Amino acid sequence: NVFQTRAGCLIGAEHVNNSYECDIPIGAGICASYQTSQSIIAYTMSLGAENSVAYSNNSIAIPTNFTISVTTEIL
Amino acid sequence: LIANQFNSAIGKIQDSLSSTASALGKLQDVVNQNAQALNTLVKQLSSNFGAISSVLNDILSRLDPPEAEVQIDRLITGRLQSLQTYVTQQLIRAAEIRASANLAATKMSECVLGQSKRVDFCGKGYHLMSFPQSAPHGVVFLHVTYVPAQEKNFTTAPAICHDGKAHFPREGVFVSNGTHWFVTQRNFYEPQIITTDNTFVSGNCDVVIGIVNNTVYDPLQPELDS
Amino acid sequence: PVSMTKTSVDCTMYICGDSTECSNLLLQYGSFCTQLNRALTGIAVEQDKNTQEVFAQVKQIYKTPPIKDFGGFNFSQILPDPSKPSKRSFIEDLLFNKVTKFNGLTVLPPLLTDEMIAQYTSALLAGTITSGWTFGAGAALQIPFAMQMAYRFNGIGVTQNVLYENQKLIANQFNSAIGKIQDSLSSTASALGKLQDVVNQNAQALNTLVKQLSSN
Amino acid sequence: IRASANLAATKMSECVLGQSKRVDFCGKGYHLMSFPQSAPHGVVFLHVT
Amino acid sequence: ALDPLSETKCTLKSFTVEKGIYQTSNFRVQPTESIVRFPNITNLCPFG
Numbered sequence: 306n307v308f309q310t311r312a313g314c315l316i317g318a319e320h321v322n323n324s325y326e327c328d329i330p331i332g333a334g335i336c337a338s339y340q341t342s343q344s345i346i347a348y349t350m351s352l353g354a355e356n357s358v359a360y361s362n363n364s365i366a367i368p369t370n371f372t373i374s375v376t377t378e379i380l
Numbered sequence: 381l382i383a384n385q386f387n388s389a390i391g392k393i394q395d396s397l398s399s400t401a402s403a404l405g406k407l408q409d410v411v412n413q414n415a416q417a418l419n420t421l422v423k424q425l426s427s428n429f430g431a432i433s434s435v436l437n438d439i440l441s442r443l444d445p446p447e448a449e450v451q452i453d454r455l456i457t458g459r460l461q462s463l464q465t466y467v468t469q470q471l472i473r474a475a476e477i478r479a480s481a482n483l484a485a486t487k488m489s490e491c492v493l494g495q496s497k498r499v500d501f502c503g504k505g506y507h508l509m510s511f512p513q514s515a516p517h518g519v520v521f522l523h524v525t526y527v528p529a530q531e532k533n534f535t536t537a538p539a540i541c542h543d544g545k546a547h548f549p550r551e552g553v554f555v556s557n558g559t560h561w562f563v564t565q566r567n568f569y570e571p572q573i574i575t576t577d578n579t580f581v582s583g584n585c586d587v588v589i590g591i592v593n594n595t596v597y598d599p600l601q602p603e604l605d606s
Numbered sequence: 607p608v609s610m611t612k613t614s615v616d617c618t619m620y621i622c623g624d625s626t627e628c629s630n631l632l633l634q635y636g637s638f639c640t641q642l643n644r645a646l647t648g649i650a651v652e653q654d655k656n657t658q659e660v661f662a663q664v665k666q667i668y669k670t671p672p673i674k675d676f677g678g679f680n681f682s683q684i685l686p687d688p689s690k691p692s693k694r695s696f697i698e699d700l701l702f703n704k705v706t707k708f709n710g711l712t713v714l715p716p717l718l719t720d721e722m723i724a725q726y727t728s729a730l731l732a733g734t735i736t737s738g739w740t741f742g743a744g745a746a747l748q749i750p751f752a753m754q755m756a757y758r759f760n761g762i763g764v765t766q767n768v769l770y771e772n773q774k775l776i777a778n779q780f781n782s783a784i785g786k787i788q789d790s791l792s793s794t795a796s797a798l799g800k801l802q803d804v805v806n807q808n809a810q811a812l813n814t815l816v817k818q819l820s821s822n
Numbered sequence: 823i824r825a826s827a828n829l830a831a832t833k834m835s836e837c838v839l840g841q842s843k844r845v846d847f848c849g850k851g852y853h854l855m856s857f858p859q860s861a862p863h864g865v866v867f868l869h870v871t
Numbered sequence: 872a873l874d875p876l877s878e879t880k881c882t883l884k885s886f887t888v889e890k891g892i893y894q895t896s897n898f899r900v901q902p903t904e905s906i907v908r909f910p911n912i913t914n915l916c917p918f919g
């Protein structure tokens with residue numbers, strides 16, 4: 306249970322090939338979390354959901370419905 | 381529908397702020413930092429800095445002035461250095477607080493007292509308004525924004541050929557559901573008949589790349605024919 | 607500039623490395639070196655936070671479609687190069703190529719590596735070229751690039767027909783301007799000086815630090 | 823550097839993700855669009871006006 | 872000094888440690904033996 310990364314030596318966390326959102330940042334793209342029976346896992350943090358656009362020169366995506374949202378900004 | 385959505389969203393915000401404590405962290409830590417700093421200063425009263433005792437009442441009640449002065453000199457050097465570090469940290473933190481307060485003041489000015497055209501400056505989405513709320517050493521802005529929810533894919537064209545002239549939409553965009561061509565506002569699907577009060581003429585169909593051939597209704601024709 | 611070098615200086619090793627008596631004498635000062643360690647860790651986490659706030663502003667990863675028809679606008683100079691091991695653009699490669707210990711001072715690697723920052727930039731570029739501003743305020747809604755340029759022109763008060771009549775000319779001028787930007791960025795490196803000096807300053811600081819290890 | 827990063831983040835949010843109406847905020851001229859590019863410890867904005 | 876958890880506990884002077892990463896100490900490899908090297912001096916000096 307020893308993992309060598311560009312951030313150093315990590316002992317106790319299991320290396321998982323699957324990528325997830327960063328929970329506890331370690332560094333150099335490596336982040337840690339507690340997941341499944343449960344244990345500490347280390348993984349390359351994901352950058353977001355993959356979403357390609359249906360681009361063309363004669364197509365428009367127009368909203369037919371909307372929503373009114375409220376966000377909280379603390380300062 | 382807008383009223384119901386706004387009320388439900390305000391209820392959700394209430395539930396989140398009453399159920400998530402960490403949502404206040406960005407404020408609490410600040411206080412903690414200050415407290416931490418203060419604590420460190422207090423802890424610096426326990427250091428000897430080489431003196432035989434940390435409490436001054438013991439030093440003055442044990443040493444003759446010629447040596448009590450040396451011990452007090454060590455103590456005052458240490459204490460003045462620690463206090464100087466403390467006040468420097470406090471000044472830097474106060475500069476940061478002043479920057480954040482200026483940002484919050486600009487936000488209050490351009491978001492609550494008016495309408496901000498800056499995207500993502502008053503929250504995610506098309507900003508509509510904002511409401512201020514007090515907080516212990518803080519401000520909470522409730523930003524009301526417009527977000528597209530459901531979308532549809534239509535066929536478009538940069539211009540429409542009617543009689544050899546190039547017609548462009550005054551407001552909105554030309555779309556096609558597969559059988560009919562309409563003009564609708566960009567931020568909401570609302571197909572309208574292509575008319576002369578919705579489009580304008582400029583040039584001919586020989587300049588626009590991708591212009592489609594269709595018809596443009598003239599409201600003056602049925603009025604003049606009768 | 608966005609971030610600095612995440613330097614971390616070990617107090618105990620810097621002042622009294624491999625010396626027990628010096629550490630015992632330093633213990634007579636309380637929590638000075640611990641508080642400076644806390645300060646440098648705060649600096650590091652602040653650098654990571656500003657990097658995250660600058661680059662991680664999109665919820666999805668956007669990509670350009672296999673079709674490159676942008677109405678004559680050539681974007682291969684700022685789009686990613688699929689042939690490079692680091693998925694960065696040609697201009698970004700030129701920029702990266704044109705920019706230039708054991709006493710308890712270390713350098714922690716950044717949380718967000720160069721490849722992830724390049725992927726962020728590519729996603730944002732694809733979003734802004736293929737969906738306008740809809741991907742920021744909401745979902746990425748496809749719009750032809752000519753129509754996006756027409757919207758940008760309507761935003762400044764010039765009619766879309768003025769763009770359409772000079773569409774080929776506008777595209778040619780844009781391509782020539784991108785080529786000129788490439789030439790200017792490849793010719794001289796002083797344009798990015800506002801960054802390099804920063805590093806130099808930090809380096810100089812470190813230098814001064816180690817130089818103060820030689821004073822009596 | 824934190825102040826400069828806040829400025830760069832605001833500029834990327836309002837000039838790349840939208841159309842800013844401030845003159846000289848997105849380069850000389852009437853702002854049309856902006857493109858972000860990575861750089862060693864920095865960001866290069868191509869402001870098209 | 873029992874385990875990394877207790878190390879974090881006394882570095883944070885608290886019985887409750889929140890979720891996150893915390894720097895606790897500094898590891899340093901200790902030398903195993905001493906190596907003395909001196910010239911093969913062949914002549915005791917007439918100090919007497």
Ligand SMILES: *[C@@H]1O[C@H](CO)[C@@H](O)[C@H](O)[C@H]1NC(C)=O
Nearest residue numbers: 360361362363590673674675
């Ligand atoms: C774009 O317009 C050209 C010109 O007619 C057409 O051939 C092409 O199919 C259109 N779509 C794409 C994706 O190029």
Ligand SMILES: *[C@@H]1O[C@H](CO)[C@@H](O)[C@H](O)[C@H]1NC(C)=O
Nearest residue numbers: 369370371372381385529530
């Ligand atoms: C739009 O979506 C909301 C979601 O709650 C729904 O209540 C409303 O009926 C929808 N309106 C239309 C016109 O689709």
Ligand SMILES: *[C@@H]1O[C@H](CO)[C@@H](O)[C@H](O)[C@H]1NC(C)=O
Nearest residue numbers: 541542544585591592593594
């Ligand atoms: C109508 O538009 C089409 C589209 O290219 C063009 O070929 C045709 O000449 C135009 N005029 C007609 C059909 O009278």
Ligand SMILES: *[C@@H]1O[C@H](CO)[C@@H](O)[C@H](O)[C@H]1NC(C)=O
Nearest residue numbers: 674675676679680681682683
């Ligand atoms: C853009 O320019 C490159 C060379 O500068 C060329 O290879 C390419 O065909 C051009 N058009 C694109 C990428 O659509």
